[PDB]
Symmetry: C3
């Protein structure tokens, strides 16, 4: 039975789209999630919506309670999580407005708990060393890629996201350096969200929309909040459409072996006395 | 009305130089600054002096209250901040004793709050994503460069500072890696000082004096505290002279458009509910 | 008088090997070490054995009390520390089971105290900026290399360890990036252990045993806890044999000048008011 957690879903919380809408404020061993969980059916698939920075956005990416968010989604029975994120492009070929179905990350965060198994929570006892060779769920990504093609969307089938601590944007020297490291897009939220989802045995995938060229690129306006917001206003409809069309495809795909292997990977990553 | 905050201005607290001296301890919403603020006029420009690691004090760069320092300077009405820092050279051409008017940074810090807008201070509400394409005030840097030329100083008109967490110096593998990333000089304090100044709408620039070659030469003597102190004793007079001669040039330059654009950049970087 | 601290010392706590075995639970100004100190003589050299993650314990590398561990060893009179660590190989030529006598590191940790001189401790007043040009004791490394050759062990005479925060393993994009930085092996514990040992004036060296190829081969099976444990089970004796044969060579080598220079380096790295 699939249940899809949706983070950043802007704007699936719509009475025309979400049937049987119900709201829930949960607590977790790691504190309160960023917002209420919004439950319902989208195209007859059970979904759980969670706004990442709250309903009226008051949280720097550094302070988002990623642990509580993922724990809550796991506790609701989510088998999948699909997230949407804006990002900067570090490659000429990834133009603003393009979607990138990211398949790797590079962590540049510093302040962030990245495990449930922190020695202080008896619902997550021991030490977990989760594999990150393939951080994003391949089958979900394939569906996203296929669906984007059908919709005629500008879409890149792979990409490496560098997640910076923020909340500042990168310097130009940083932007150039990230390019030499192999990063293709840049954001502030993929890590540790993706890591925690893997620990929880959840199939996680990300829809990244490029909104700017960061500040590496000749002749473009360098990134700012207004440049990001402007591109999202002109393009964010694309991510919503991609998600809407993807959800029922996930609902009608077979998952038991994928989910079993994720469960095993998570279980056998934990060391006990 | 220009007012120049000066960090690491050691020798400017001199009765021959600083007229109308007052000392005071300020408190801020982010705690106490590193030292008392010393107010006065240098060459008929209002200045505010602030020792970065305390007057005598024993504080690692990781633990300097950068937020309080910049907030305090902002609250005193500082329009500009000019800082002096020692640094290691990562380039043969940047010799010990040389000044570098840095124009970029690479952040290698991990422990450091880099924003005033942390969700816990009602004088800095919301989330701020400050642009860092050009972290240092161009007009102040131009004055510094011009003044250094007039003084006959060996001075590099640009350079990328990598700021490490410290307090340890870098390994040789780190030193070589920083060179490959495009870093030219290395220190422990530029980040997050530069970032916070930009959030506060302050024109920030840095005078970096090379004191050593870090450890990327295998044949040459590596950096140590004694090597740094020795070079500063033999050269620090240069940074003082540069600052002294720069201050009245800043006092007599037009700033209203520069400061307006900084104010706008800072204001429109803030997201609210 | 040499005394060798041994961290991760794979089966040296054996009544056939360790003469005069004594167990001791110590406290330090930085808290409790990871396990009891086990004191005794191995081949007539005073040794102090310390398990890094505890005897029956389960603690993330982020939370190991490295300060207490090194302080305790220093307080017992250790002149040398030899550590064993598992690691991932980032180079084809470093095969699982191979030993690497590492000579450099790259720090990718974020959460970790790296100094005793933190402004809050009795025995460690001031600020310490320890040189890290040569983090590992050259003479100990030479003995390790020579001894490995005599034993017929597959052994690499140098290597750069990248230490990641963990507890997660690296992504494939991270693994590839570390290769481009010049890292040869990867672990979670070298930093800050090596840094703190240098601050304490201790001759520190590391025996790294490769257990996997991380995840930088796309065709090959990526690292997991089970893959690491399997390789360790298959390679259980090598590090012990190397250490056993190395210990008396360290005992019969001259150290007074090496230790004097380490003491001086540590002492003159400290700044006071
Ligand atoms: C199609 C996804 C829509 C969901 N959504 C809404 C928003 C609100 C936008 C607030 S602007 C600041 C955000 C954007 N966000 C991503 C981003 C874009 N460009 C970047 C760059 N050059 N460097 C680093 N990060 C970025 C970072 C910041 O939190 N973000 N994602
Ligand atoms: C030009 C006037 C500067 C004023 N002033 C005095 C002092 C006292 C310095 C105490 S020595 C340790 C400091 C130096 N300082 C800069 C530095 C120099 N070389 C570096 C290198 N290779 N790697 C990293 N950082 C450095 C870092 C340390 O806190 N610092 N600034
Ligand atoms: C077969 C019994 C041996 C007893 N035993 C258990 C242990 C604990 C090992 C648990 S596995 C996870 C550890 C390994 N250890 C080193 C390591 C190896 N490969 C790495 C890689 N690719 N990336 C980062 N680190 C590593 C890190 C982690 O704590 N050590 N000795
Ligand atoms: Cl983001
Ligand atoms: Cl880094
Ligand atoms: Cl510094
Ligand atoms: Cl290779
Ligand atoms: Cl390790």
């Amino acid at each position: 039975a699939v249940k899809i957690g949706i983070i950043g879903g802007t704007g699936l919380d719509d009475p025309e789209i979400l049937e049987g809408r119900t709201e829930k404020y949960v607590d977790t061993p790691f504190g309160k999630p960023s917002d209420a969980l919004i439950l319902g059916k989208i195209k007859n698939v059970d979904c759980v919506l969670l706004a990442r920075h709250g309903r009226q956005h008051t949280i720097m990416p550094s302070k988002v309670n990623y642990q509580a968010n993922i724990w809550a989604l796991k506790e609701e029975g989510c088998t999948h999580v699909i997230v949407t994120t804006a990002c900067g492009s570090l490659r000429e070929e990834i133009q603003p407005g393009d979607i990138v179905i990211i398949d790797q990350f590079i962590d540049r965060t510093t302040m962030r708990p990245q495990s449930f198994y922190d020695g202080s929570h008896s619902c997550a006892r021991g030490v977990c060393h989760i594999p990150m060779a393939e951080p994003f769920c391949p089958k979900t990504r394939e569906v996203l890629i296929e669906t984007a093609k059908k919709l005629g969307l500008r879409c890149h089938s792979k990409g490496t996201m560098v997640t910076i601590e923020g909340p500042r944007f990168s310097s130009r020297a940083e932007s150039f350096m990230f390019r030499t490291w192999g990063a293709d897009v840049i954001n502030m939220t993929t890590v540790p969200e993706v890591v925690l989802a893997k620990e929880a045995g959840i199939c996680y995938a990300s829809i990244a929309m490029a909104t700017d060229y960061d500040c590496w690129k000749e002749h473009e306006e360098a990134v700012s909040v207004d440049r990001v917001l402007k591109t999202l206003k002109e393009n964010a409809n694309k991510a919503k459409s991609l998600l809407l069309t993807t959800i029922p495809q996930i609902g009608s795909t077979e998952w038991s072996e994928t989910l079993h292997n994720l469960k095993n990977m998570a279980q056998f990553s934990v060391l006990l006395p």
